[PDB]
Design a protein around this ligand. Structure first.
Ligand SMILES: Nc1nc2c(ncn2[C@@H]2O[C@H](COP(=O)(O)OP(=O)(O)O)[C@@H](O)[C@H]2O)c(=O)[nH]1
Lengths: 199, 181
């Protein structure tokens, strides 16, 4: 309700959002009539990237699996031909938000090979996932590394699981059980969690 | 005790089974009494030898790399998979399989347990670094070959009792079960 549009948006000859209306209306138009859902997302982006520059608010753009925007799709036309990511309005309107042509906020993103298309299992570095186009689009950017648990983090995670009584095997609390957990997961948080799920 | 045919060969005379029993009974009676050195040698003329199968376990030598770190190398085989492992005396439990961390090279937990078995058995988890190169076969054949190679390399840094225990656990034996025609 505080944020207000700055242009008349025409959903249909009958229905339009007048200048100065609260942003929520646009969102509601996307939630009520799905026909205008995709048009309603872009408008939202167009407002937020603009008004944040004016200084009304700080904006955080948090995109998980950002590597999907400059990759390939598994979507097809009716002629069984491939569709590129830029052909999608939802993906085309989200790339504009990744460009640093606005101020008053920060853009945070996290790569993910899980669910990625046409990538090998062991590819995890920025270029391998992003592609040339993705790296060029994000360049310049600050990369931050996320590693496996160090001994302190691993011990704290197991102490949390023991404090929630989530490790029911009688040997898991013992030190030998902890060494075996450490070896079998190699301190990887996901593998450790999955192995602790059925212990 | 010397077998019947060996007594035949030494005496250069054929003898039945009952008279060989009788001779062995006399020899045992002589053994029971306080036989002297001459009698002990006379008995030893009639007692052959045998051997064991624990000294035939080869313990590889310890080599040194350029940095001065001690290590030991070995080979293992499982089906068509062939593994070549290097175990360092000191380490932090880092295993590199074809230059790749083991939890990445072996997604399946069974293979990671196979790699864990050798160190867990002798309680040296997190005390050694391993660099191994495997080729051929599938995931399970590769894991078994790596386990064999790494156990054969680890035999160099453990006590002879631990080497025998690893042998008796079936860790130092190549599996001969292969696909049949
Ligand atoms: N229904 C409707 N959607 C609009 C209207 N204007 C903009 N949009 C949507 O909001 C988004 C705004 O992004 P935009 O800057 O215009 O990108 P571009 O015009 O395609 O180059 C567009 O992708 C449109 O889908 C409008 O007047 N009516």
């Amino acid at each position: 309700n505080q944020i207000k549009v700055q242009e008349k948006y025409v959903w249909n000859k009958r229905e339009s959002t007048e200048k100065g209306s609260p942003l929520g209306e646009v969102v509601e138009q996307g939630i009520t009539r799905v026909r205008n859902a995709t048009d309603a997302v872009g408008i939202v982006l167009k407002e937020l990237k603009r008004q944040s520059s004016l200084g009304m608010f700080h904006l955080l753009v948090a995109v998980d699996g950002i590597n999907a925007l400059w990759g390939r799709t598994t979507l097809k036309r009716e002629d069984k031909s491939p569709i590129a990511p830029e052909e999608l309005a939802l993906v085309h309107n989200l790339r504009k938000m990744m460009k640093n042509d606005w101020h008053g906020g920060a853009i945070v993103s996290a790569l993910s090979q899980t669910g990625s298309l046409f990538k090998p299992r062991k590819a995890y570095l920025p270029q391998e996932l992003l592609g040339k186009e993705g790296f060029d689009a994000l360049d310049p950017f600050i990369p931050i590394l996320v590693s496996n648990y160090n001994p302190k983090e691993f011990e704290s995670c197991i102490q949390y699981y023991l404090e929630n009584n989530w490790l029911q095997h009688e040997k898991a609390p013992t030190e030998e059980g902890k060494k075996e957990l450490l070896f079998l997961s190699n301190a990887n948080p996901s593998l450790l969690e999955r192995h602790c799920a059925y212990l | 005790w010397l077998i019947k045919e060996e007594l035949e060969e030494m005496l250069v005379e054929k003898l039945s089974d009952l008279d060989y029993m009788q001779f062995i009974r006399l020899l045992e009676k002589l053994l029971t009494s306080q036989c002297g050195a001459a009698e002990e040698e006379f008995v030893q003329r009639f007692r052959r030898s045998v051997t064991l199968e624990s000294k035939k376990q080869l313990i590889e030598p310890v080599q040194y790399d350029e940095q001065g770190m001690a290590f030991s190398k070995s080979e293992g085989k499982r089906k068509t998979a062939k593994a070549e492992a290097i175990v360092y005396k000191h380490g932090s439990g880092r295993i590199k399989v074809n230059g790749i961390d083991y939890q990445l090279y072996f997604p399946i937990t069974q293979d990671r347990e196979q790699l864990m078995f050798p160190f867990h058995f002798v309680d040296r988890l997190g005390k050694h670094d391993v660099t191994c190169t495997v080729s051929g076969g599938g995931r399970s054949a590769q894991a078994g070959a790596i386990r064999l190679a790494m156990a054969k390399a680890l035999c160099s840094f453990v006590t002879e009792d631990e080497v025998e225990w690893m042998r008796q656990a079936g860790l130092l034996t190549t599996d001969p079960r292969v696909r049949e025609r």
